[PDB]
């Protein structure tokens, strides 16, 4: 509350560390469905169904340009990529499986880096 703060967590390395995580996600072999925005002209249904499209390149541009106010807003966009994927793809598809794998990979890096 006013003039009453918890001790100050050091957040000065967060930008760099989210960048590194993102690099590792970008270079994973199962990243291919997520590297670029889904082409809304060429994928019937995507535009109407997925209200908030998100992909690694869009996260990279937002990160590089100071559009994440904190590390939680960064995690929310990463998770959105996988939630979108689950919404549009069957679990038993290559892309469906990619999404589960990448989410697992992300969540571990996230815990190990920050928790």
Curated annotation (Swiss-Prot):
Tissue specificity comment: Expressed at varying levels in several tissues, whereas a smaller transcript was expressed specifically in testis.
Residues in Bromo domain copies: 9-113
Subcellular locations according to the entry: Nucleus
Source species, domain of life: Eukaryota
Assembly and interaction partners: Component of the BRF-1 ISWI chromatin remodeling complex, at least composed of SMARCA1 and BAZ2B, which regulates the spacing of histone octamers on the DNA template to facilitate access to DNA. Within the BRF-1 ISWI chromatin remodeling complex interacts with SMARCA1; the interaction is direct. Component of the BRF-5 ISWI chromatin remodeling complex, at least composed of SMARCA5/SNF2H and BAZ2B, which regulates the spacing of histone octamers on the DNA template to facilitate access to DNA.
Summary of the function given for this chain in its UniProt record: Regulatory subunit of the ATP-dependent BRF-1 and BRF-5 ISWI chromatin remodeling complexes, which form ordered nucleosome arrays on chromatin and facilitate access to DNA during DNA-templated processes such as DNA replication, transcription, and repair. Both complexes regulate the spacing of nucleosomes along the chromatin and have the ability to slide mononucleosomes to the center of a DNA template. The BRF-1 ISWI chromatin remodeling complex has a lower ATP hydrolysis rate than the BRF-5 ISWI chromatin remodeling complex.
Annotated family: Belongs to the WAL family.
Protein name stated in the entry: Bromodomain adjacent to zinc finger domain protein 2B
Biological source species: Homo sapiens (Human)
Complete-protein stretch covered: 2054 to 2166 of 2168
């Amino acid at each position: 509350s006013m003039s009453v703060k918890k001790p100050k967590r050091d957040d000065s390395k967060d930008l760099a560390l989210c960048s590194m995580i993102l690099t590792e996600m970008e270079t994973h072999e199962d990243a291919w469905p997520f590297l670029l925005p889904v082409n809304l002209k060429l994928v019937p249904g995507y535009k109407k169904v997925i209200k908030k499209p998100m992909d690694f390149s869009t996260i990279r541009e937002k990160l590089s340009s100071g559009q994440y106010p904190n590390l939680e807003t960064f995690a929310l966009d990463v998770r959105l990529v996988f939630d979108n994927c689950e919404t549009f793809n069957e679990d038993d598809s290559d892309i469906g499986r990619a999404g589960h794998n990448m989410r697992k990979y992300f969540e571990k890096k996230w815990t190990d880096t920050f928790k």
